[PDB]
Design a protein around this ligand. Structure first.
Ligand SMILES: [Cl-]
Length: 493
């Protein structure tokens, strides 16, 4: 791993072969699945001891064929609003107590009622496994089955999802909190596959239409019905190879408009968000920077947790990866020893690249006034030489991001003792901070590019010439300085 993996990928054929080999290397072995099955069997035994006629259904990463080494083992146990909430929570604590106190080998048992779908986190010591026990999630089961079915429908699915998942983990695009879940990312890949000119994957509406006799199923008021096998469904006529589809993925999701679109896997289509239409239809949908609709429960946005910074970092990293995919280093293999193809994508992100990927949130303001205020801040308030979404090239011959404290203190003392410089204000900012900058003091020391997107309005700062490698300091400083600059500039109206 991380060593054997590198040489395994570098040695084999073309890019697609690298993706497939990656799938073969990351996927669970027969022993891991056997162990998981045994643990699930034990859980089943104890839960049957407590709940006669209860079924333990593994869901999530285990049964969806997207499994990787060390992945979570998620178990669904199958057996007045706040009374219902409290009852569900009580049942949850019941199951949690059964886990914590009865079944052999399990430790680390923590009840999580506060989550969207309440769950009991558990760890099993002897097998060295961990996961979530869900009381009610019946949807995760069906959509997991939908994922495995998606893998069975076309062979390129698993390579694309595995490669893009590893890449996302590498670019810091995936995880908990503000980041994208593996499920959300998977649904994004599948959506991409649905929207290709020849479709690679069918729309979920088409699957529901096909369905089958007795294959009809309804969960929580939603239609989960799809064909159980891929044999009753015609294959894809899309001939595009793995690498081409990867590059197309990067380019596509780089060029998409995420705020103005709710991506539907059911209709295999982009539904306009603005204004109000999908939020009026399903009534439960939370709209945000990135909107990706669950194929079954349509009131649920799987990406709804994603902040503007995370979506921005996503599209930036995708544009960069698309810029790499066009290069010869990607398409063609290497003679001896050099990194090619998938390797630069899976390799860890440079701090400069990691910081330049995630943009800087700016105060709300009209695009023109915002750009004007920005270039005014760089030009006037800083020593930046600037030149002409929007973008500008900026050059700094000075250390201006650092040393402002000492200089400001010196100016404070000098002005405290006697007459200083300035223009009389009730809190003006620009000119004063410009003086603070100018009191800190022809090849450019550090040169960088600033870029603002139309929606949402955010500044992306990427390096150009950085001989001394001081760019990240500048980036942090800008993260702090620019928002308050625009903030004080908004109060001049
Ligand atoms: Cl497209």
């Amino acid at each position: 791993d991380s060593h054997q993996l590198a040489k395994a990928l570098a040695e084999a054929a073309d890019v697609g072969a690298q993706m497939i080999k990656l799938v073969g290397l990351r996927e669970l072995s027969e022993a891991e699945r056997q162990l998981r099955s045994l643990v699930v069997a034990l859980m089943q035994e104890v839960f049957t001891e407590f709940f006669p006629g209860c079924v333990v259904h593994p869901f999530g990463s285990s049964i969806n064929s997207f499994d990787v080494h060390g992945c979570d083992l998620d178990l669904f146990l199958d057996l007045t609003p706040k009374e219902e909430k409290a009852e569900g929570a009580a049942m949850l604590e019941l199951v949690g107590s059964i886990l914590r106190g009865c079944v052999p080998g399990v430790y680390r048992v923590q009840t999580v009622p506060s989550a969207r779908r309440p769950v009991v986190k558990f760890a099993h010591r002897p097998s060295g496994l961990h996961g979530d026990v869900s009381l009610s999630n019946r949807l995760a089961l069906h959509n997991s089955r939908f994922l495995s079915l998606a893998s069975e429908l076309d062979g390129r699915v698993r390579p694309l999802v595995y490669t893009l998942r590893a890449w996302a983990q590498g670019r810091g695009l995936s995880g908990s909190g503000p980041l994208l879940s593996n499920y959300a990312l998977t649904l994004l890949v599948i959506y991409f596959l649905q929207t290709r000119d020849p479709p690679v994957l069918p729309t979920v509406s088409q699957l529901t239409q096909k369905a089958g006799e007795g294959e009809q199923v309804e969960v929580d008021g939603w239609d989960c019905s799809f064909p159980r096998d891929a044999s009753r469904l015609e294959p894809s006529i899309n001939v595009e190879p793995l690498s081409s589809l990867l590059a197309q993925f990067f380019s596509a999701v780089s060029s998409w408009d995420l705020r103005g679109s709710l991506l539907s896997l059911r209709e295999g289509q982009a539904l306009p968000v603005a204004g109000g239409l999908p939020s009026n239809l399903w009534e439960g949908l939370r709209l945000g920077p990135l909107n990706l609709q669950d194929p079954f429960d349509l009131s649920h946005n799987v990406a709804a947790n994603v902040t503007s910074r995370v979506a921005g970092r996503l599209q930036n990293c995708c544009r960069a990866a698309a810029n790499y995919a066009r290069s010869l280093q990607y398409q063609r293999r290497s003679s001896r020893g050099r990194d090619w193809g998938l390797l630069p994508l899976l390799q860890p992100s440079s701090p400069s690249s990691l910081l330049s990927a995630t943009p800087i949130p700016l105060p709300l303001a009209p695009f023109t006034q915002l750009t004007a205020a920005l270039v005014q801040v760089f030009r006037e308030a800083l020593g930046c030489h600037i030149e002409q979404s929007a973008s500008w090239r900026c050059a700094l011959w000075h250390r201006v991001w650092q040393g402002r404290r000492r200089a400001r203190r010196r100016l404070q003392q000098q002005t405290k003792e006697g007459a200083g410089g300035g223009a009389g204000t009730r809190a003006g900012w620009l000119a004063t901070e410009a003086q603070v900058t100018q009191e800190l003091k022809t090849e450019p020391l550090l040169s960088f590019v600033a870029s603002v997107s139309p929606a949402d309005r955010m500044l992306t700062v990427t390096p150009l010439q950085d001989p001394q490698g001081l760019f990240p300091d500048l980036h942090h400083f800008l993260q702090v300085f620019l928002p308050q600059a625009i903030r004080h500039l908004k109060l001049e109206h």
